[PDB]
Amino acid sequence: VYFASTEKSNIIRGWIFGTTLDSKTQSLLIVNNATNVVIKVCEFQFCN
Amino acid sequence: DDFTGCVIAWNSNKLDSKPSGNYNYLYRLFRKSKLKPFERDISTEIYQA
Amino acid sequence: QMQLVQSGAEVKKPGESLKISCKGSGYTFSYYWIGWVRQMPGKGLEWMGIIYPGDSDTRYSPSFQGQVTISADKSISTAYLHWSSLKASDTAMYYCARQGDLGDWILLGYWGQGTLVTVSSASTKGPSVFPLKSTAALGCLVKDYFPEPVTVSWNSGALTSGVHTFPAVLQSSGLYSLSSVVTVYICNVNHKPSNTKVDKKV
Amino acid sequence: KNLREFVFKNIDGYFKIYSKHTPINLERDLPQGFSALEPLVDLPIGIN
């Protein structure tokens, strides 16, 4: 999936990847901020 | 099919086996679809046959 | 029932290359990894190595690659320990262990009874026994003995109730001294390292 | 105005990320031309 954004002050701060996204299978999570980014794949129970 | 490297296999009957049964090793026997190259599926949900 | 026992205690001079054996039973001694654990007096456990009785595959600790060798005999289910060029720092309590069905192959499940090994140049000096306002209790005294594992009994083991043994005390001359009492008689002192048994009546 | 582009690809268990930013005028979004994205992060996840 090609992602593109042009919002000022980098409002977007990460992406989510997975297949079911209900803690039933390993899922990728990307978090971005002003200091350091954390990329971790886990069985997250993603919210709405 | 384009795998490049080495596969190292050796007998481990003296390490990963016990007379009472070394049941700590599991393998996936039923699944809805085949695995892609370098894919992992740790889900333990009961497969509907 | 599965049982695991080792050889008796020994005391030799540095450089005699003594040998300790272990006898197991109650299970197939071809599939369980058997090993040994060293424990010097005052410190913790120190693992030396293990051996798989099914073949000649052996593993040893990096600190015991050449200081001690481990062997086993599958035909009689007997393990052996061998040393070379003994030193003063080799005296320690050795406990055997087996794999067992509790956990993995490296986890030690069961243990033996232990074998005391003492390496010194005292040539196993012989002990001396002497008897000891009570009215009441009686006792005896053991002096002038270098080896530690000295056992004292009363009436060849017929008296067990009311019998108490106090710890040994190291004299300034380099020899130990213990004393055992009995609540009220011949006290039997058996010096196993020298096979010297002395009977004394109070 | 600054434009950010991203490409997220997952092939044979390896997750590849491409990123490159190109400042564009405030006329409109996604202008004509070409801007090749460079790879920055490559890690295997082995998940679907």
Swiss-Prot record, chain D:
Glycans are attached at residue 48. Changing residue 4 to S: In strain: Gamma/P.1. Changing residue 48 to Q: Increased resistance to neutralizing antibodies. Attaches the virion to the cell membrane by interacting with host receptor, initiating the infection. The major receptor is host ACE2. When S2/S2' has been cleaved, binding to the receptor triggers direct fusion at the cell membrane. When S2/S2' has not been cleaved, binding to the receptor results in internalization of the virus by endocytosis using host TFRC and GRM2 and leading to fusion of the virion membrane with the host endosomal membrane. Alternatively, may use NRP1/NRP2 and integrin as entry receptors. Binds to host ACE2. RBD also interacts with the N-linked glycan on 'Asn-90' of ACE2. Cleavage of S generates a polybasic C-terminal sequence on S1 that binds to host Neuropilin-1 (NRP1) and Neuropilin-2 (NRP2) receptors. Interacts with host integrin alpha-5/beta-1 (ITGA5:ITGB1) and with ACE2 in complex with integrin alpha-5/beta-1 (ITGA5:ITGB1). May interact via cytoplasmic c-terminus with M protein. May interact (via N-terminus) with host bilirubin and biliverdin, thereby preventing antibody binding to the SARS-CoV-2 spike NTD via an allosteric mechanism. This is Spike protein S1. It comes from Severe acute respiratory syndrome coronavirus 2. The chain holds residues 187 to 234 of 1273 of the full protein.
